[PDB]
Every structure is written in C-alpha cells, then in structure tokens.
Amino acid sequence: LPLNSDYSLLLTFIYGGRVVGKTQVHSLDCRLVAERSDSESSMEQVEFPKPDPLEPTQHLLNQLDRGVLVASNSRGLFVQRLCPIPISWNAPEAPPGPGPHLLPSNKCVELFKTTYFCRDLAQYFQGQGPPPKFQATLHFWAASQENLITVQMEQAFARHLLEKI
Amino acid sequence: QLEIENRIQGLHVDIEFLVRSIRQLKDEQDVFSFRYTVFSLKSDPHQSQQAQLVQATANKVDRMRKEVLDISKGLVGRLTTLVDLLLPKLDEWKVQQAASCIGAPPPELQLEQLEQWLTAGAKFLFHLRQLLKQLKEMSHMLRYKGDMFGQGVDLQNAQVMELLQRLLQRS
Numbered sequence: 313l314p315l316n317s318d319y320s321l322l323l324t325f326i327y328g329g330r331v332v333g334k335t336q337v338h339s340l341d342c343r344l345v346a347e348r349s350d351s352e353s354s355m356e357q358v359e360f361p362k363p364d365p366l367e368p369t370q371h372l373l374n375q376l377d378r379g380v381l382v383a384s385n386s387r388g389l390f391v392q393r394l395c396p397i398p399i400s401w402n403a404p405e406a407p408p409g410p411g412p413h414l415l416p417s418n419k420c421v422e423l424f425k426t427t428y429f430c431r432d433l434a435q436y437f438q439g440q441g442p443p444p445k446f447q448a449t450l451h452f453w454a455a456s457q458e459n460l461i462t463v464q465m466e467q468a469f470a471r472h473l474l475e476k477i
Numbered sequence: 478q479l480e481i482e483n484r485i486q487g488l489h490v491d492i493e494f495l496v497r498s499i500r501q502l503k504d505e506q507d508v509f510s511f512r513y514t515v516f517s518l519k520s521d522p523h524q525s526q527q528a529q530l531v532q533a534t535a536n537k538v539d540r541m542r543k544e545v546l547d548i549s550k551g552l553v554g555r556l557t558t559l560v561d562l563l564l565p566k567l568d569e570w571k572v573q574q575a576a577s578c579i580g581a582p583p584p585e586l587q588l589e590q591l592e593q594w595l596t597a598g599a600k601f602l603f604h605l606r607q608l609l610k611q612l613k614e615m616s617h618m619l620r621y622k623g624d625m626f627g628q629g630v631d632l633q634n635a636q637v638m639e640l641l642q643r644l645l646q647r648s
Contacts, residue, residue, distance in 0.1 A: 344531070348534070351500070352501065352537070353501075354508060354533060355508050381508075381511050383511070385526075385527060386521045387518070387634070392511050456479075
C-alpha cells in the first residue's frame with residue numbers, strides 16, 4: 313500500500329437498468345443531492361443526473377432533501393443516509409443475512425475497507441483465499457416499491473490492483 | 478404609513494434569510510458529526526488530512542453559530558422598535574375613540590389597519606420563537622452543548638416572549 317494511492321471515489325448512477333452518468337470525486341467527502349443548494353458547505357455536493365424522460369425518476373429525486381453522505385478516504389468507504397427514501401446496499405462488508413440490508417437513518421455505515429482488502433488480496437496472490445470484492449452498490453426505492461435509482465461506488469486503487477491480472 | 482409598511486416589508490425578507498441561514502447551519506452540523514464519526518471509526522499519515530478536515534468543519538459551525546445569533550439579535554431588536562412604536566399608537570387610538578363618544582372627531586387611522594399591523598408583527602415573533610426553538614435543539618448537538626451559544630438563544634427567547642406578552646395583552 314504505497315502513499316501514492318488513489319482513494320478517489322468513482323460514482324456510477326443507474327436509472328432503471330441504464331447508466332445515466334459517471335463521476336470521479338477527488339475529495340474526501342461528497343453529498344449526493346437532487347439539485348445543488350445555495351449554501352456555504354465545506355463538503356462537496358454532487359448532483360444526480362437530471363432524468364431526460366423526467367419520470368418516474370424525478371418524483372423520487374425530489375424527496376432526497378438532505379441526500380446521502382459518502383466518505384472516500386484511506387480507510388475505505390463510509391455512508392450516511394439523511395433522506396426519507398429507503399436505501400438498500402450491497403458491499404464487501406455487508407453482514408450475512410437473508411433479507412436486504414437497509415441504511416439506518418442517523419448512523420454512519422462502513423461500506424468498504426482498505427485494510428481487509430489488502431489482507432484478503434495478499435492471501436489470494438499467495439493462494440489461501442478468493443480475490444477481494446470492492447464495489448459498494450446502493451439501491452434507492454420509491455412507491456409498489458420499485459428500485460428506480462441505483463448508484464455503484466468504488467475506489468480507483470482497488471480496480472487498478474486487480475485488473476493487472 | 479410607509480415607515481411601518483417598510484419596516485414590516487423588510488422583516489419578511491430578513492426572517493426568510495434567517496430561516497435560510499438556520500438551514501445552512503443545520504446542514505453543516507450534520508457534516509461535522511458525520512466527519513467526526515468517520516474520523517473516530519478505525520495509523521496512516523493520511524489521518525492527519527482526516528483530522529484537519531474535521532478541525533475545519535467545527536470552525537464553520539462555530540462561525541455560523543455566532544453569525545446566526547447576530548442575525549436574530551438584530552431582528553429581536555427591530556421587532557422591539559416596531560412593537561414599541563405600534564402599541565403606543567393603538568393606545569392613542571383607544572383614547573381618541575373614547576373621546577369621540579363625548580364629542581370629539583373620529584381618529585384618522587382606521588382600527589382595521591392597526592390590527593393587521595399588530596397581527597403581522599405578532600406573526601413575526603411567533604415565527605422567530607419557532608426558529609430559536611430549533612437552534613436550541615441544534616445546541617444539543619454535543620455534550621457541553623455550547624454554553625455561550627445556548628445562553629444566546631435562551632436570552633433572545635426571553636426577549637421574544639416579552640414582546641409577545643406585550644402584544645397579546647393589548648390585542
């Protein structure tokens with residue numbers, strides 16, 4: 313794990329099985345919002361892609377309000393849900409459960425970790441385990457309940473190490 | 478009278494601006510606690526960058542907290558000037574009306590316009606009480622709360638209530 317490691321966030325917005333945008337966010341933090349607010353916030357704000365057809369996605373984005381907070385640093389990915397829209401998620405650190413894993417309001421959730429990625433990666437190259445996973449998908453729901461929006465997340469250093477072989 | 482109309486003219490604009498400032502603060506207090514929590518979750522020298530980030534978020538919160546009190550304190554004082562100017566006028570109306578019953582001329586200013594001004598002036602004080610009530614909840618963000626910031630809200634909440642107590646007695 314060199315110092316020159318690219319922990320930048322790589323977002324991928326999906327609306328109903330269609331990739332509607334990609335965004336690299338070189339900041340430690342960002343907030344995913346429908347439309348950027350006029351305020352002096354130390355944290356960057358990343359707008360969702362504006363739906364061209366306008367429905368049913370637009371009705372869903374207009375309920376985000378506070379939106380979603382994502383932190384992409386040296387220790388991995390962290391998220392906090394501030395919106396009333398339900399959010400499920402799948403990531404390497406998801407627990408072993410039958411049903412869906414839902415982001416709780418007012419609780420910072422650890423999605424991805426670099427420590428265990430390096431550990432499980434060193435074990436594969438040597439040959440004592442499977443290769444590590446890194447994508448941290450997020451699924452938004454809307455009213456019956458349909459997964460209209462999907463957001464994938466990953467760090468640049470992760471895919472670069474694996475795709476070599 | 479324009480001085481009133483223009484006084485309550487800008488009060489609308491400035492309490493709106495206050496409401497926006499309070500939303501800006503609320504949004505940022507979430508930022509801090511998020512970064513604070515992330516910083517607490519677990520060294521890599523990169524963590525210095527992580528701490529400097531949290532350190533810079535509390536300064537904005539502190540700066541904003543002090544800039545919100547400055548706004549609302551200016552409004553509290555302005556609302557006082559308006560109340561202190563409105564109620565003596567209504568007093569002069571009650572007198573001039575009472576005299577009209579024993580042979581005086583009617584008062585020039587209608588009571589319909591006075592009641593609207595006292596209602597619009599009251600609607601500002603209730604709105605401001607709600608906003609200070611929100612800041613008092615934000616003051617509970619952390620354990621020590623903010624002994625100086627919390628007292629500023631409490632001290633303004635008292636003034637707002639004294640202005641209401643004035644208005645609600647003679648209206």
